[PDB]
From a paper:
Here, we report a comprehensive structural and functional analysis of the previously uncharacterized protein P116 (MPN_213). Single-particle cryo-electron microscopy of P116 reveals a homodimer presenting a previously unseen fold, forming a huge hydrophobic cavity, which is fully accessible to solvent. Lipidomics analysis shows that P116 specifically extracts lipids such as phosphatidylcholine, sphingomyelin and cholesterol. Each monomer consists of two distinct domains: the core domain (residues 246–867) and the amino-terminal domain (residues 60–245), situated distal to the dimer axis.
To obtain empty P116 that is free of any bound ligands, we treated the P116 samples with the detergent Triton X-100. Mass spectrometry confirmed a massive reduction of lipids in the sample. The structure of the empty P116 sample was solved by cryoEM at 4-Å resolution. Its overall topology is almost identical to that of the original P116 sample; however, the core domain is constricted as a result of fingers 1, 2 and 3 being closer to the palm by 8, 13 and 12 Å, respectively, and finger 4 moving 11 Å sideways to retain the distal core access to the cavity. Consequently, the huge hydrophobic cavity reduces to two pockets that are large enough for lipids to pass through but that appear unoccupied in the cryoEM density. A comparison of the filled and empty P116 structures shows that the original densities that were unaccounted for create massive steric clashes in the constricted configuration, demonstrating that the cavity can no longer accommodate lipids. In the empty P116, the dimerization interface is shifted towards the dorsal side of the molecule by 10 Å, resulting in a contraction that changes the arc diameter of the dimer to ~10 nm and shifts the N-terminal domain towards the dimerization interface. Most prominently, the arc diameter of the empty structure is approximately 10 nm smaller than that of the original and refilled structures. In the empty P116, we observed a substantial reduction of lipids, with no specific lipid class enriched.
Author numbering: 60 to 868
Write the structure that this text describes.
């Protein structure tokens, strides 16, 4: 028969951690370090009430799987005797008896997972001598779907058959104790990891080659440059569609992705191979897409990339499902049944899917989209909000974390997404006009007195950017650059002072006209494809093989010398780009009031006027009435030598273009970048160690720590092609000419900016984390990740800094 199981239940629970030292509240230790504290946890869960039922289940599993599955067709079983000594003593001494007898009339042999080899005849009562010595239970790690620390037992002694089976195991790699962890796992931490993974001819040493290192670094530089070119082209392949349209027809950010689907595909398969088609299909899985598709063929038109992007996490499911991920790839199971079988196997796929809540957070969304069908995508798949824009922000943030020095784009996108709104611009809307409602509108929606205290976003951005660099035009920036409707729309005020829909009434458009013209210009002249063609990167040295240095448990880089003369060609910061953002300034003919307010009836010249009225003019002394004869004809000359037919637009036109506004053509030259600047990655005596992902991964990389990134921006010629003056009717022509004076001062200040704000041989030190991927997405560097000795755990906090699994002790 069989032994009686009075404690066959296996229900149990997990454990927790306690803060120590100055580690953050997020405790994520690994194995090692506490090799004797898991001893304590196992003893604690070993010498209590719920321990002996679990040991009953352990012995049940052993006597079931390890005794009579290779038996029991021709050997019966009987184990009348059973006792436990699992008290608080925590020791080990077991006392069972199991009797084996055969009912068959034949000579057979007992199959046991042990040194068992003996002839057995029919009707024989095999004796299985069960006894134990005194010992303490070691600890085995589990191969759970969680790969937790194995709060479990490695046995050391059982006196069986009259002998000892050294380092015995009762059913290894499985236990009925369910003592999983959510914080601390098993393996080699990062440095005990960087102890059996780096050596003389060991793993990382033998799987990284000098030619591969050089190819990886040079391809990283080329990818950086080229991705910059794609990003610029988009900013000019999207701006052209933003601004080329006439008002009255919307064009949002999701609609504009229709014109740059292949552009995103190129960008995303250049940042990471195999992902370009994914993002193009993703954009096609939107409301504004030309074709409407579901998320099933989207999620399965690559498989590996999506599973390894979403499920990354630390583990415990990626490499675990890698026993079924390859099985999941099998049969590609065949067409017209592949969909059905994948929907069927989602039932066991879903745990890895639901183990989310890191940066990639749309895994719950995809699991709801995959459990049941989805049809309309025209809001039903838009309420997920883990949508094109959010995922774009996520992956671009990842790119920034890998490429720190393009911080401007990710930053500006962050305050773009800093609001809970603007989600409709990720769908059917009009992009530039709505963002003007967001960037260039003082929201005052009411009619009592005034709700103008909602300063627009672009005003705040420029007041933070150009805050107090110059003190003269700050009041100008407030008065006519910001208190304007051009940089502060003041909605509902247009329909509060007129309320008849006149041409100049609708102030959302008059700002929009100039902003859209600037977008059109950037989309056809400056950042067009034709003009962005002539921004070329070329090799300089790129020939010396970067051989590795090895010294025991270390791996070093001898020397690096790579230079990249980024030829700027003649990038045409064209006359006309500035013309639009000059249209940002008012064109009203009331110039005289503006100059009277800024220069005379202001905050500082008024003080000097009062001072000179009171006293002054040294040398004269007694002449007090002359002062109201001095600041009465100087102002007369200044305000009589201004042509009223010109507007402040034309004043800044003289200041910037040189000649006046309407006589200056867009097909001129205004700024034409010359020469070429150089990037100088290099480093000598640099360490190299196994590079892990932002969190754990099965796929080891290799990062070269200590690269000295020298950016020499010199050897450029930023010419201001209108460097002289040829004017005929200056706005302030006369004996007080500012237009020529302003042109001189602007040329001087712009030369100062281009000489100082630009090249200074900026130096920067960082680390290159390159995960060299093979042709068919089969990255060369890898571990066995099978034995409980190479499961590296980067999320560990090393015990060298000090870790104790006790509450502040």
């Amino acid at each position: 028969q069989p032994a009686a199981a009075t404690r066959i239940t296996v229900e149990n629970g997990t454990d927790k951690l306690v803060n120590y030292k100055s580690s953050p509240q997020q405790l994520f230790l690994a194995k090692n370090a506490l090799k004797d504290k898991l001893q304590g946890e196992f003893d604690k869960f070993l010498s209590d009430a719920k321990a002996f039922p679990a040991l009953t289940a352990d012995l049940q599993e052993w006597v079931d799987q390890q005794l009579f599955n290779p038996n029991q067709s021709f050997f019966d079983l009987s184990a009348p005797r059973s006792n436990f000594t699992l008290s608080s003593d925590k020791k080990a001494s077991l006392d069972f008896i199991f009797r084996f007898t055969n009912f068959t009339e034949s000579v057979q042999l007992l199959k046991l997972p042990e040194g068992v080899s003996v002839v057995v005849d029919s009707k024989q009562s095999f004796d299985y001598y069960v006894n134990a010595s005194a010992q303490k239970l070691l600890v085995l790690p589990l191969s759970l779907p969680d790969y937790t620390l194995g709060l479990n037992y490695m046995f050391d002694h059982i006196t069986l058959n009259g002998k000892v089976v050294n380092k015995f195991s009762f059913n290894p790699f499985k236990t009925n104790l369910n003592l999983a962890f959510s914080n601390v796992y098993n393996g080699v931490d990062v440095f005990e990891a960087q102890k059996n993974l780096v050596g003389k001819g060991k793993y990382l040493n033998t799987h990284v080659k000098a030619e591969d290192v050089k190819k990886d670094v040079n391809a990283n530089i080329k990818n950086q440059f080229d991705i910059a070119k794609i990003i610029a082209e988009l900013m000019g392949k999207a701006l052209k569609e933003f601004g080329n349209q006439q008002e009255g027809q919307p064009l949002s950010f999701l609609k504009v992705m229709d014109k740059v689907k292949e552009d995103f595909e190129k960008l995303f398969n250049l940042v990471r191979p195999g992902l370009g088609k994914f993002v193009k299909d993703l954009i096609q899985s939107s409301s504004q897409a030309e074709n409407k598709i579901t998320v099933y063929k989207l999620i399965f038109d690559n498989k590996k990339t999506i599973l390894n992007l979403l499920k990354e996490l630390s583990i415990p499911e990626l490499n675990s499902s890698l026993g079924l991920v390859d099985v999941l790839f099998d049969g590609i199971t065949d067409s017209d049944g592949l969909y059905e079988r994948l929907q069927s196997f989602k039932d066991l796929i879903v745990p890895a899917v639901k183990t989310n809540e890191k940066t990639a957070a749309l895994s719950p969304l995809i699991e709801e989209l995959l459990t049941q069908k989805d049809t309309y995508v025209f809001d039903l798949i838009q309420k997920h909000k883990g949508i094109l824009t959010n995922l774009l922000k996520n992956f671009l943030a990842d790119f920034q974390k890998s490429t720190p020095f393009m911080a401007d784009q990710v930053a500006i996108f962050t305050e773009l997404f800093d609001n809970e709104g603007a989600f409709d611009l990720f769908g059917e809307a009009d992009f530039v006009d709505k963002i003007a409602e967001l960037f260039l509108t003082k929201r005052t929606v009411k009619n009592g007195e005034k709700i103008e205290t909602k300063d627009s976003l672009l005003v705040t951005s420029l007041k933070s950017l150009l805050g107090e660099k110059v003190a003269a035009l700050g009041d100008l920036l407030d008065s006519y650059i910001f208190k304007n409707e051009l940089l502060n729309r003041s909605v509902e005020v247009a329909k509060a002072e007129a309320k008849d829909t006149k041409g100049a009434t609708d102030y959302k458009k008059e700002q929009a006209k100039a902003l859209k013209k600037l977008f059109k210009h950037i989309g056809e002249n400056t950042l067009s494809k034709t003009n962005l063609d002539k921004i070329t990167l070329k090799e300089v040295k790129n020939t010396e093989n970067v051989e590795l240095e090895e010294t025991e448990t270390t791996l070093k880089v001898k020397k690096l010398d790579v230079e990249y003369k980024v030829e700027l060609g003649n990038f045409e910061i064209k006359n006309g780009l500035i013309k639009a953002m000059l249209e940002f300034l008012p064109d009203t003919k009331d110039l005289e009031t503006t100059l009277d307010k800024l220069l005379f009836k202001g905050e500082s010249y008024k003080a000097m006027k009062d001072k000179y009225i009171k006293e002054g003019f040294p040398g004269y002394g007694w002449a007090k009435g002359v002062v109201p004869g001095a600041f009465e004809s100087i102002e007369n000359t200044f305000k009589s030598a201004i042509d009223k037919t010109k507007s402040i637009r034309d004043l800044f036109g003289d200041m910037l273009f040189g000649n006046d506004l309407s006589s200056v053509k867009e097909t001129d030259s205004f700024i034409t970048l010359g020469g070429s600047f150089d990037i100088k990655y290099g480093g000598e005596n640099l360490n190299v160690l196994p590079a892990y992902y932002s969190l754990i991964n099965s796929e080891i990389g290799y990062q070269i720590i200590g690269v000295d990134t020298t950016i020499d921006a010199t050897k450029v010629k930023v010419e201001l092609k209108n460097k002289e003056y040829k004017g005929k009717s200056p706005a302030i022509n006369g004996q007080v000419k500012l237009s020529q004076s302003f042109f001189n001062v602007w040329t001087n200040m712009f030369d100062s900016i281009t000489k100082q704000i630009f090249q200074k041989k900026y130096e920067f030190k960082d680390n290159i984390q390159v995960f060299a991927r093979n042709e068919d997405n089969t990255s060369r560097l890898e571990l066995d990740i099978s034995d409980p000795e190479q499961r590296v755990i980067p999320f560990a906090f090393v015990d060298g800094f000090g870790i104790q699994l006790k509450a502040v002790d």
